Amino acid sequence: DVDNASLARLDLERKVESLQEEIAFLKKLHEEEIQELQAQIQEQHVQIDVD
Amino acid sequence: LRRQVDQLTNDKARVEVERDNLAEDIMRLREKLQEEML
C-alpha cells in the first residue's frame, strides 16, 4: 500500500499532467485557429469606394 | 502534478531498495542472537 496508494495518486496525477499538457497543446493550436481568423481580417482588403 | 509523480518515483524505488538491503543487514543481527542463545 505504499506502492498502491502512491500509484493511485500517480495514475490520476499523470492523467491530469497529460491533460494539462494537452490543454497547453490545444491552446498553442487554438493560436493557429485565431490565426485563420486574423488571416480573414488580413484578406478583407478587398472592396470598392462607397457612395 | 509531476512533483508528486517524482515523489512515488523516489518512494517506490526506495521501499524496494530498502527491503532487499535490510533483509540481510537485520537477518545478520538475528543470526548473532542465535549464536548468543545456542
Binding site: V2, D3, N4, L7 | V15, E16, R19, D20
Partner: peptide
C-alpha cells in the same frame, strides 16, 4: 503494472524469508 510489480516484490521477499527460515529450521533439526 509497476505498483503490481512492487506488491509481488513484497510477496517474493516475504515468502523468500519464510522458506529460508523453514529450510534453516530443517538444517537446525539436521
Amino acid at each position: 503494472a509497476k505498483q503490481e510489480s512492487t506488491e509481488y516484490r513484497r510477496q517474493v521477499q516475504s515468502l523468500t524469508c519464510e522458506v529460508d527460515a523453514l529450510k534453516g529450521t530443517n538444517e537446525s533439526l539436521e
